[PDB]
């Protein structure tokens, strides 16, 4: 029993994702070129890809019903904390179980564990990242579920530095109710069973990955030489 509002919410989140996610990956040609030889050799390319993906996530977020009613400061706090997580989430669409890699339509734009290693991150982060991708991919989400999960991740009350937790919660709640009802009404067994609880668990996994990223990012970024390889938006969003 999907309300008219709920069907509305889904239609908006699908369009917003379509407008901010190009399944052809055409823009990837504008990044500094990938290099798979030295140490940090994929960093310039992958920082570009991250920076781009931050812009696209910001453009998705702005379309989330209710998001615009938040304060500018709270919008900032939510994006800054969720950015890496949504990039992780949104990355699942290019992630392929065959190769255990992210496949962006080209050999040059196909990323594996070793490429991520060339970004300067350890296996301590990379291993759980790939495991995350595998478990998320196995959920086999409908695109409606996927777009809802992204929006729910962005509008989390439980983010440090939030001013209006209560308004953020009421925005999320309406997305959570929309998702729950969608799974029940639009999702067929067996795919649907405990699907919500598993989607909720991925949000928890993302938080742990986010913690580990911030740590390795401080280590990477702490050196000025490495920091120079990043983009101005990546430095503003992640830190410096």
């Amino acid at each position: 029993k999907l309300s008219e509002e709920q069907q509305h919410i889904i239609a908006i989140l699908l369009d917003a994702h379509h407008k901010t996610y190009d399944p052809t990956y055409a823009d990837f040609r504008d990044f500094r070129p990938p290099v798979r030889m030295s140490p940090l050799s994929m960093l310039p390319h992958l920082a570009d890809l991250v920076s781009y993906s931050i812009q696209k996530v910001i453009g998705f977020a702005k379309m989330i019903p209710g998001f615009r009613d938040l304060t500018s400061d709270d919008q900032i706090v939510l994006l800054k904390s969720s950015a890496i997580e949504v990039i992780m989430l949104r990355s699942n669409q290019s992630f392929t179980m065959d190769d255990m890699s992210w496949d962006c339509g080209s050999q040059d734009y196909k990323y594996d564990v070793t490429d991520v290693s060339k970004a300067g991150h350890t296996l301590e982060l990379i291993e759980p990242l790939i495991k995350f991708q595998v478990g998320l991919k196995k959920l086999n989400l409908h695109e409606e579920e996927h777009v809802l999960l992204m929006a729910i991740c962005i509008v989390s009350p439980d983010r440090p530095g939030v001013q209006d937790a209560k308004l953020v919660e009421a925005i999320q709640d309406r997305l959570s109710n929309t998702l729950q009802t969608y799974i029940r009404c639009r999702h067929p067994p067996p795919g649907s069973h405990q699907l919500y609880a598993k989607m909720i668990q991925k949000l928890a996994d993302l938080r742990s990955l986010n913690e580990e990223h911030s740590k390795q990012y401080r280590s990477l970024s702490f050196q000025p030489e490495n920091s120079m390889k990043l983009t101005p938006l990546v430095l503003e969003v992640f830190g410096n």
């Binding site: 812009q55 910001i58 453009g59 977020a61 702005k62 615009r68 500018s72 400061d73 919008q75 900032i76 994006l79 800054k80 101005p232 938006l233 503003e236 969003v237």
Partner: peptide, 11 residues
């Protein structure tokens, strides 16, 4: 708070 780029992209 020191986020000019993010703020500009948001609106």
């Amino acid at each position: 708070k020191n986020h000019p780029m993010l703020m500009n992209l948001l609106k």
